[PDB]
Write a protein that binds this ligand. Sequence first.
Ligand SMILES: *[C@@H]1O[C@H](CO[C@@H]2O[C@@H](C)[C@@H](O)[C@@H](O)[C@@H]2O)[C@@H](O[C@@H]2O[C@H](CO)[C@@H](O[C@@H]3O[C@H](CO[C@H]4O[C@H](CO)[C@@H](O)[C@H](O)[C@@H]4O)[C@@H](O)[C@H](O[C@H]4O[C@H](CO[C@H]5O[C@H](CO)[C@@H](O)[C@H](O)[C@@H]5O)[C@@H](O)[C@H](O)[C@@H]4O)[C@@H]3O)[C@H](O)[C@H]2NC(C)=O)[C@H](O)[C@H]1NC(C)=O
Ligand SMILES: *[C@@H]1O[C@H](CO[C@@H]2O[C@@H](C)[C@@H](O)[C@@H](O)[C@@H]2O)[C@@H](O[C@@H]2O[C@H](CO)[C@@H](O[C@@H]3O[C@H](CO)[C@@H](O)[C@H](O[C@H]4O[C@H](CO)[C@@H](O)[C@H](O)[C@@H]4O)[C@@H]3O)[C@H](O)[C@H]2NC(C)=O)[C@H](O)[C@H]1NC(C)=O
Ligand SMILES: *[C@@H]1O[C@H](CO[C@@H]2O[C@@H](C)[C@@H](O)[C@@H](O)[C@@H]2O)[C@@H](O[C@@H]2O[C@H](CO)[C@@H](O[C@@H]3O[C@H](CO[C@H]4O[C@H](CO)[C@@H](O)[C@H](O)[C@@H]4O)[C@@H](O)[C@H](O)[C@@H]3O)[C@H](O)[C@H]2NC(C)=O)[C@H](O)[C@H]1NC(C)=O
Ligand SMILES: *[C@@H]1O[C@H](CO[C@@H]2O[C@@H](C)[C@@H](O)[C@@H](O)[C@@H]2O)[C@@H](O[C@@H]2O[C@H](CO)[C@@H](O[C@@H]3O[C@H](CO)[C@@H](O)[C@H](O)[C@@H]3O)[C@H](O)[C@H]2NC(C)=O)[C@H](O)[C@H]1NC(C)=O
Ligand SMILES: *[C@@H]1O[C@H](CO[C@@H]2O[C@@H](C)[C@@H](O)[C@@H](O)[C@@H]2O)[C@@H](O[C@@H]2O[C@H](CO)[C@@H](O)[C@H](O)[C@H]2NC(C)=O)[C@H](O)[C@H]1NC(C)=O
Ligand SMILES: *[C@@H]1O[C@H](CO[C@@H]2O[C@@H](C)[C@@H](O)[C@@H](O)[C@@H]2O)[C@@H](O[C@@H]2O[C@H](CO)[C@@H](O)[C@H](O)[C@H]2NC(C)=O)[C@H](O)[C@H]1NC(C)=O
Ligand SMILES: *[C@@H]1O[C@H](CO)[C@@H](O[C@@H]2O[C@H](CO)[C@@H](O)[C@H](O)[C@H]2NC(C)=O)[C@H](O)[C@H]1NC(C)=O
Ligand SMILES: *[C@@H]1O[C@H](CO)[C@@H](O[C@@H]2O[C@H](CO)[C@@H](O)[C@H](O)[C@H]2NC(C)=O)[C@H](O)[C@H]1NC(C)=O
Ligand SMILES: *[C@@H]1O[C@H](CO)[C@@H](O[C@@H]2O[C@H](CO)[C@@H](O)[C@H](O)[C@H]2NC(C)=O)[C@H](O)[C@H]1NC(C)=O
Ligand SMILES: *[C@@H]1O[C@H](CO)[C@@H](O)[C@H](O)[C@H]1NC(C)=O
Ligand SMILES: *[C@@H]1O[C@H](CO)[C@@H](O)[C@H](O)[C@H]1NC(C)=O
Ligand SMILES: *[C@@H]1O[C@H](CO)[C@@H](O)[C@H](O)[C@H]1NC(C)=O
Ligand SMILES: [Ca+2]
Ligand SMILES: [Ca+2]
Ligand SMILES: [Ca+2]
Ligand SMILES: [Ca+2]
Ligand SMILES: [Ca+2]
Ligand SMILES: [Ca+2]
Lengths: 476, 472
Amino acid sequence: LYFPQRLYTENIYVGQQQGSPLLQVISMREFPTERPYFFLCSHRDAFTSWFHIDEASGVLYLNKTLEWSDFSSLRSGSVRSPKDLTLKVGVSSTPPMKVMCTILPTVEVKLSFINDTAPSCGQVELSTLCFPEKISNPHITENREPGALRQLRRFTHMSICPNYTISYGVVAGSSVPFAVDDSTSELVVTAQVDREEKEVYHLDIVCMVRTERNLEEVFRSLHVNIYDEDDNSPYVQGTDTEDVLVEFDRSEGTVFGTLFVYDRDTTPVYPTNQVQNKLVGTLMTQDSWIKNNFAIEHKFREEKAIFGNVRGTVHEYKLKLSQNLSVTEQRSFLLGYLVNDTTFPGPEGTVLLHFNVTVLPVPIRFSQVTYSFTVSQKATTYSQIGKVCVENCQKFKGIDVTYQLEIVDRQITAEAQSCYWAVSLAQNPNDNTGVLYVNDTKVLRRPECQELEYVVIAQEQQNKLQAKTQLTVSFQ
Amino acid sequence: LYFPQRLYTENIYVGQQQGSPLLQVISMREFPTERPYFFLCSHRDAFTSWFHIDEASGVLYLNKTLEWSDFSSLRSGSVRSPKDLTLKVGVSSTPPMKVMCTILPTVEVKLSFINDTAPSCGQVELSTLCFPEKISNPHITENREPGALRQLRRFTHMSICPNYTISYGVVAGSSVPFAVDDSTSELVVTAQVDREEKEVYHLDIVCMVRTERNLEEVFRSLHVNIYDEDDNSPYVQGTDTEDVLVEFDRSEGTVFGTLFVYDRDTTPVYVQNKLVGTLMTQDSWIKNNFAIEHKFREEKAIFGNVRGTVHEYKLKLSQNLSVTEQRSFLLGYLVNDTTFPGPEGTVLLHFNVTVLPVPIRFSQVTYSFTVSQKATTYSQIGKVCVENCQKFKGIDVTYQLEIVDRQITAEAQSCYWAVSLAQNPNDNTGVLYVNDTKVLRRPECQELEYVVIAQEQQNKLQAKTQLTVSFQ
Ligand SMILES: *[C@@H]1O[C@H](CO[C@@H]2O[C@@H](C)[C@@H](O)[C@@H](O)[C@@H]2O)[C@@H](O[C@@H]2O[C@H](CO)[C@@H](O[C@@H]3O[C@H](CO[C@H]4O[C@H](CO)[C@@H](O)[C@H](O)[C@@H]4O)[C@@H](O)[C@H](O[C@H]4O[C@H](CO[C@H]5O[C@H](CO)[C@@H](O)[C@H](O)[C@@H]5O)[C@@H](O)[C@H](O)[C@@H]4O)[C@@H]3O)[C@H](O)[C@H]2NC(C)=O)[C@H](O)[C@H]1NC(C)=O
Ligand SMILES: *[C@@H]1O[C@H](CO[C@@H]2O[C@@H](C)[C@@H](O)[C@@H](O)[C@@H]2O)[C@@H](O[C@@H]2O[C@H](CO)[C@@H](O[C@@H]3O[C@H](CO)[C@@H](O)[C@H](O[C@H]4O[C@H](CO)[C@@H](O)[C@H](O)[C@@H]4O)[C@@H]3O)[C@H](O)[C@H]2NC(C)=O)[C@H](O)[C@H]1NC(C)=O
Ligand SMILES: *[C@@H]1O[C@H](CO[C@@H]2O[C@@H](C)[C@@H](O)[C@@H](O)[C@@H]2O)[C@@H](O[C@@H]2O[C@H](CO)[C@@H](O[C@@H]3O[C@H](CO[C@H]4O[C@H](CO)[C@@H](O)[C@H](O)[C@@H]4O)[C@@H](O)[C@H](O)[C@@H]3O)[C@H](O)[C@H]2NC(C)=O)[C@H](O)[C@H]1NC(C)=O
Ligand SMILES: *[C@@H]1O[C@H](CO[C@@H]2O[C@@H](C)[C@@H](O)[C@@H](O)[C@@H]2O)[C@@H](O[C@@H]2O[C@H](CO)[C@@H](O[C@@H]3O[C@H](CO)[C@@H](O)[C@H](O)[C@@H]3O)[C@H](O)[C@H]2NC(C)=O)[C@H](O)[C@H]1NC(C)=O
Ligand SMILES: *[C@@H]1O[C@H](CO[C@@H]2O[C@@H](C)[C@@H](O)[C@@H](O)[C@@H]2O)[C@@H](O[C@@H]2O[C@H](CO)[C@@H](O)[C@H](O)[C@H]2NC(C)=O)[C@H](O)[C@H]1NC(C)=O
Ligand SMILES: *[C@@H]1O[C@H](CO[C@@H]2O[C@@H](C)[C@@H](O)[C@@H](O)[C@@H]2O)[C@@H](O[C@@H]2O[C@H](CO)[C@@H](O)[C@H](O)[C@H]2NC(C)=O)[C@H](O)[C@H]1NC(C)=O
Ligand SMILES: *[C@@H]1O[C@H](CO)[C@@H](O[C@@H]2O[C@H](CO)[C@@H](O)[C@H](O)[C@H]2NC(C)=O)[C@H](O)[C@H]1NC(C)=O
Ligand SMILES: *[C@@H]1O[C@H](CO)[C@@H](O[C@@H]2O[C@H](CO)[C@@H](O)[C@H](O)[C@H]2NC(C)=O)[C@H](O)[C@H]1NC(C)=O
Ligand SMILES: *[C@@H]1O[C@H](CO)[C@@H](O[C@@H]2O[C@H](CO)[C@@H](O)[C@H](O)[C@H]2NC(C)=O)[C@H](O)[C@H]1NC(C)=O
Ligand SMILES: *[C@@H]1O[C@H](CO)[C@@H](O)[C@H](O)[C@H]1NC(C)=O
Ligand SMILES: *[C@@H]1O[C@H](CO)[C@@H](O)[C@H](O)[C@H]1NC(C)=O
Ligand SMILES: *[C@@H]1O[C@H](CO)[C@@H](O)[C@H](O)[C@H]1NC(C)=O
Ligand SMILES: [Ca+2]
Ligand SMILES: [Ca+2]
Ligand SMILES: [Ca+2]
Ligand SMILES: [Ca+2]
Ligand SMILES: [Ca+2]
Ligand SMILES: [Ca+2]
């Protein structure tokens, strides 16, 4: 059972008689043998015993003839007319119990108690007799059993105008799965519908009234919203496999591959707790190295243009690094990822995704070309002289290399050790590059201090791998 | 003219005699008829008058027979020994003049004056007869003259073993453009070289020593570096045109495409081989909204055996484009290799830009949420989102809830305290949450109806849809 309508409304008047019908609450069956049992739930309120709902038909009736004192005694806190009354109506597929009112779905019946006697039939405009002032739009879910949807007669007004005949119809320009049941005056849905074909049905209702004058007609435009269920399995467009190379970029959080999965069903905006149409993924590997270093990132968003202008869901799966992978690691594996549409009925609601991963090692090493820098200008403290970099260091990401200058010859006099102050080195972690700059220019005034031979030492941090190269600086 | 090596070193000994050769400074020609003129530059030092260099040959000679007194009087009182002597040698393309010592490049000659006589023949290994102690790895410039690179013979030790005859040769793993001149014992480079083909050569020098009953040989490993010149023009790999679509991401700083420009030459940051670009437009609108992002790196991997330069060009936004913008233009960008001789040092890049407006509208005509009566304060109810709002960048959209029924009593108004809305600028959504649970005890407060209004900041474009919240 579900309710195609969350709120009912009507006016009630002083002098309205015991036993007169007010409105009909509708429950739609989710299965053909399901039978509704209606009951009132507002037993917390005193006014609820002014009313009676028929357990089988769902028609709500006055249980008491309304009086002036009934109006004035409503403790709402607003002394003004009209006083709104809110009733709760419950429905169940078994015989009703008191506790269902606290625990089952209910409908709100909002009544406006007007502190006056009912209007005379000559005082009601045909449009009001025919159709509520503001018509709320019903909703049904796709793939459901046809059934009555809305009682079209205004019960209260046909008692004001008892000598009028009133019939309703669906005006069908195109063929629509909606009609009126002439015998009950209900709008009914005549077939199962498909949210993926149409999410909103526009309807024009015609009311035909035989007056003392002629047969009159009034038209009312409304529409029915179609709710979605998970009735489409996810699928890939093109490949289910993404080739991933891990080499010079090994930094955590970087994305190395992206696979897209599509689902024609809708999903609440990401991220959500709803379980309808949720896709849950699972790494298809028992392997500690893979699990502790790699991870899949899942996101989804609504799209419609790619689905033929029908709202569905686009999923993105991205292979991510958990932590900076050591430059010595080298592995090639085919990583499966099972994507399961959990609420898709039957065992065809999954897609297997594949990440074909190549992880190459990254050597730590200078080219065999040693550096020689010539400073043809008079040295100025802090002027950059040159840069040092291991092979392909400028492509590195997630690899920390630190550079150091050291003196080539060891058995060197104390005085000769000072010529090497002329140049120093700074880390440019922007690239993992080394920047040579001038330091002490005072030592350059010595002709022996104008040709410097250094060793540059690079050190990868995670594994402590070292590379060396030679470096000469000529102050000219 | 250029020096293949910037520092020479040798030993000199007590008892070494006037006129004995010590070593040979090398200058490498950059034109076929260019010739070097060598000269000593050392001014104030007393030991400079001890030496002489042949202006034509570059051979440094002793101009004085070294006595014990010469050593102890050199910087008297210093306890160092040996005592290092630094000489400066200059070269010129025309007849040397005094002023040239101040304004033309020089190499340093560092002589170690040993306070002893030379070793006897029986004391030295053959390698000290053949080679200098310090290994020096020379350099040569690509696209220059072949010629003598290094004197291999060790002049100071010639007489240490008078009956030994000494000659030299080169061996490598591959064929190499290097050889020994039999007549001068010079290592020669026999061809012009191309840095782009080979950046360093690894040679083994062989010294053949003919003793009184044997032909012996000792080896020395050497490396010759090739200095890079800007002799390659930049080029594009594949297409010189990038199609760029500006839609949902329109924030300042966003990069839209990558054009790759390659240059085989190296690029020292500290003007050689520098590529400078120019925006090919006068359009005020374009310039005020777009710039070209240029980054570059040096790389051996993409070029193979020899380091080259990779440049990346990307069209970047200078500010958030209004969602109402819509225009298509073709934007040229000229990249110039400013030190490449001739007019072929430039490449024209193109950006083919389509900028599309972004509509501000709901694609869902109704949001319906169902929440527990026992729901706790601040628990998330759901999210709303204008069409494609999760792709938005540089677009400011806010969301607001409005009550539908305006003719509402004060008591019914308090029902709408149960729900509030928070902005989620991260993904451009609004977040509904539970606010006041106390009003949920009232049956009239359990079905709420709102209008959701989204408003784009710049243009005040609005979108509106229905939202219902049901407390069950
Ligand atoms: C809901 O609707 C109620 C009924 O609607 C009215 O009657 C319908 C039949 C119809 O014609 C409709 O159009 C009418 O609006 C309405 O109740 C009405 O209230 C008024 C105002 O009080 C009242 O008129 C006064 O009646 C006094 C006493 O009358 C006696 O008889 C009536 C009914 O027969 C009873 O309700 C009364 O309780 C009495 O039994 C008269 O004395 C009065 O005349 C003079 O004095 C009053 C001063 O009274 C005011 O102060 C007292 C004390 O504080 C209050 O208790 C009282 O309510 C007044 O506010 C002065 O106002 C006069 O101008 C005059 O100076 C006057 O005639 C109607 O009789 C009464 N009708 C009915 C049927 O009871 C109610 O107000 C509506 N409520 C809302 C929220 O909309
Ligand atoms: C969120 O909920 C709070 C109330 O819940 C309390 O705060 C939560 C954050 C949470 O901690 C709960 O656990 C906690 O109980 C709402 O706050 C109330 O807001 C209303 C309206 O602003 C206030 O009522 C007004 O009070 C005014 C004087 O203070 C008075 O002038 C007003 O009357 C005027 O306006 C009304 C219509 O607005 C009109 O009908 C009148 O005739 C007159 O013109 C009105 O009485 C309450 O005092 C506030 N309560 C508290 C405790 O601060 C908050 O609004 C809500 N946020 C939402 C829904 O966005
Ligand atoms: C430069 O070097 C000389 C050293 O000359 C020699 O050659 C070098 C390579 C080394 O092998 C030295 O050991 C040699 O001496 C220095 O002059 C010498 O210094 C030493 C140490 O101070 C002196 O040794 C002294 O010798 C005294 C006696 O020596 C004389 O008399 C003996 C008689 O047996 C005779 O055999 C000898 O030849 C000397 O004529 C000895 O009593 C004393 O204890 C001390 O050991 C040596 O005498 C010095 N000169 C000579 C000619 O021997 C210089 O000082 C050094 N210069 C600098 C600036 O450091
Ligand atoms: C500059 O770019 C436009 C637009 O290109 C479109 O948007 C970009 C962001 C890129 O992603 C492009 O891939 C994309 O198409 C170019 O005009 C466009 O040309 C294409 C053809 O290449 C048109 O597509 C269709 O092609 C089929 C052929 O199968 C035809 O039958 C269709 O009639 C249609 O031509 C596309 O419609 C067209 N777009 C517009 C707005 O005209 C443009 O050529 C390019 N200029 C360059 C590269 O110099
Ligand atoms: C998984 O990938 C390997 C290697 O793929 C290479 O590296 C990727 C990062 C990507 O750039 C691919 O295009 C590369 O080819 C595949 O093995 C290679 O397959 C190609 C096919 O033409 C072949 O030319 C190579 O020789 C192969 N290399 C090796 C080392 O075998 C492999 O087939 C992929 N596996 C699956 C199941 O897709
Ligand atoms: C850098 O040089 C200093 C000496 O020069 C000072 O620093 C320069 C960068 C510049 O600011 C000058 O004007 C300064 O006078 C070296 O400092 C010496 O370090 C050694 C050993 O660490 C120590 O024995 C000396 O006493 C220090 N002398 C002074 C004056 O500080 C420093 O080592 C150099 N750092 C390098 C080369 O990395
Ligand atoms: C996909 O998810 C569904 C949802 O739970 C799984 O369906 C259950 O599978 C278990 C066995 O693993 C059965 O005992 C249940 O009866 C199944 N239905 C349920 C729980 O509603 C399904 O197995 C998953 N498919 C996979 C992992 O391939
Ligand atoms: C993984 O690599 C990144 C980038 O190379 C490292 O990031 C730096 O980490 C140090 C560690 O103290 C910080 O001081 C720096 O501020 C970080 N800089 C940047 C740009 O990220 C990171 O530390 C490495 N390891 C981990 C576990 O993050
Ligand atoms: C590419 O860059 C070169 C080098 O800057 C430009 O050549 C110079 O242009 C100026 C401007 O007229 C002249 O005065 C110089 O004589 C030119 N040569 C040098 C060495 O500066 C050249 O114009 C640029 N090419 C383009 C197409 O803009
Ligand atoms: C109608 O009201 C009377 C009270 O006068 C009560 O006894 C009876 O049970 C009520 N009927 C219904 C259906 O609520
Ligand atoms: C309806 O018609 C009957 C019979 O003609 C008449 O008795 C009754 O009063 C009429 N009712 C109205 C509201 O006109
Ligand atoms: C070299 O050989 C000759 C014999 O031909 C011999 O007389 C001489 O002493 C040897 N040594 C030197 C240093 O000449
Ligand atoms: Ca469907
Ligand atoms: Ca569906
Ligand atoms: Ca689905
Ligand atoms: Ca070249
Ligand atoms: Ca070059
Ligand atoms: Ca170049």
